[PDB]
Amino acid sequence: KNKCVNFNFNGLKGTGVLTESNKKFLPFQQFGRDIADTTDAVRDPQTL
């Protein structure tokens, strides 16, 4: 967290720096997107 790393969450294959998010996903949902269809948040597979 807080370090620019390449992240591979179940094959999402994105690059960026990871921070804790206050947003609450629905249980079935796995990753989040913004208006521009860019990955904005990801749920950690190991944890929830």
Partner 1 sequence: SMTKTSVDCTMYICGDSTECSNLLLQYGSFCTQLKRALTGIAVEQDKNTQEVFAQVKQIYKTPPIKYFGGFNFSQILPDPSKPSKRSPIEDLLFNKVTKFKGLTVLPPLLTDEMIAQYTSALLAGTITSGWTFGAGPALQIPFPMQMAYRFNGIGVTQNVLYENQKLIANQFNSAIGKIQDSLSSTPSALGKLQDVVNHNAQALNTLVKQLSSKFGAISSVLNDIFSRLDPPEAEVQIDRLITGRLQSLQTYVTQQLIRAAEIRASANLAATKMSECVLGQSKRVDFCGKGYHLMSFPQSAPHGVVFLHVTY
Q: Is residue 15 a contact residue for ligand NAG (CB under 6 A)? A: no
Q: Which of residues 36, 46, 47, 48 is near partner 1 by CB under 8 A? A: 36
Question: Does residue 15 sit in helix, strand or coil?
Answer: strand
Residue 36 C-beta: closest distance to partner 1, Å: 5
- Which two structure tokens, joined as six digits, stand for 7? 């992240």
**Whether 5 contacts 17, CB under 8 Å:** yes
| Positions in 17-46 near ligand NAG (CB under 6 A) | 46
Nearer to ligand NAG, 22 or 47 (CB): 47
